[PDB]
Paper text:
Within this class of proteins, the bromodomain and extraterminal domain (BET) family contains four members that are transcriptional coregulators and that recognize acetyllysines (AcKs) using a tandem pair of highly homologous bromodomains (BDs). Despite heavy academic and industry investment in this area, the generation of paralog-selective inhibitors has proved elusive because of the extremely high sequence similarity between the bromodomains of family members (90 to 95% within the acetyllysine-binding pocket residues). Using the highly conserved BET BDs as a model system, we conducted three mRNA display-based RaPID (random nonstandard peptides integrated discovery) screens using a single library (which contains >1012 unique members). Crystal structures of 13 distinct peptide–bromodomain complexes revealed highly diverse structures and binding modes among the cyclic peptide ligands.
Likewise, the most abundant family identified in the BRD3-BD2 selection (BRD3-BD2 family 3, accounting for 53% of total sequencing reads recovered for the top 500 peptides, including 3.2C) was not found in the BRD3-BD1 screen. In contrast, 3.2C bound to the BD2 domains with affinities of 10 to 100 nM but did not bind strongly to any BD1 domain, consistent with selectivities of >10- to 100-fold between these domains. Like 3.1B, both peptides bind two copies of the BD. In contrast to 3.1B, however, almost no direct contacts were observed between the two BDs, suggesting that in these cases crystallization might have promoted the bivalent interaction. The two AcK residues (AcK2 and AcK6) in the peptide each engage a BD via the AcK pocket although, in both cases, the N-acetyl moiety lies too far from the conserved Asn (Asn391) to form a direct hydrogen bond. It is likely that water-mediated interactions are formed, but the relatively low resolution of this structure (2.8 Å) prevented us from directly observing solvent water. The two peptide–BD interfaces bury 1,120 Å2 (BRD3-BD2-A) and 1,116 Å2 (BRD3-BD2-B) of surface area and the peptide contacts very similar surfaces in the two domains —a surface that significantly overlaps with the contact surface for 3.1C.
Numbering used by the authors:
A (entry chain A): 307 to 416
B (entry chain C): 1 to 12
C (entry chain B): 308 to 416
The structure:
């Protein structure tokens, strides 16, 4: 049901959501609830929200055609974090630390 | 996870 | 409100200020046991308390004296200490916030 490339993608998605990286992956677990976190401007600047919860739903829904479309949403997720938060925020360092994990395993695929 | 404004905290 | 509780609201205002947001934010709103999936929080903590609840009682003129105000603020910290393990970061944040409260509160006529 899943291609060989997308099998590796789902395994990558699984590691990013594991207990291993929970110290810095937690900001990206669920979609940004602008009201629940009192960030009333998130949707005035981020017009295409994305988070790991949304990404897994699209993966299980078989909505990703290739690995490129999967990499697009995860990189969009980090771009939303970098575009909205100040550069010195610790969550930005968490986005960096989590993306550095993603880019590593994603680069090692045939 | 207690959340609030871009802060976080693992209670469970 | 009497003159004593006027100073109390100023302490509550400082506890809710921009200054202490780094460690006071867990105690801003009540503990949502369902949003955190802690099915035992209300089986162990029978009197939950937070700073929002304290402000409602302060604005509602429900505190008779400053002692009733300090009782609920210490109950809030006591709730945090009773449930979480001592090595949890919430304890370190509760102490540093309580350390601020006890300092302001001890200096009252």
């Amino acid at each position: 049901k899943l291609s060989e490339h997308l099998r590796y993608c789902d395994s990558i998605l699984r590691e990013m959501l594991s207990k291993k990286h929970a110290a810095y992956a937690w900001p990206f677990y669920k979609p940004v609830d602008a009201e629940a976190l009192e960030l009333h401007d998130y949707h005035d600047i981020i017009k295409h929200p994305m988070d790991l919860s949304t990404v897994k739903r699209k993966m299980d829904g078989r909505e990703y055609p290739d690995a490129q479309g999967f990499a697009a949403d995860v990189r969009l997720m980090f771009s939303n974090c970098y575009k909205y938060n100040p550069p010195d925020h610790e969550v930005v360092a968490m986005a960096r630390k989590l993306q550095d994990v993603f880019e590593m395993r994603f680069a090692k695929m045939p | 996870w207690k959340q609030w404004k871009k802060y976080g905290l693992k209670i469970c």
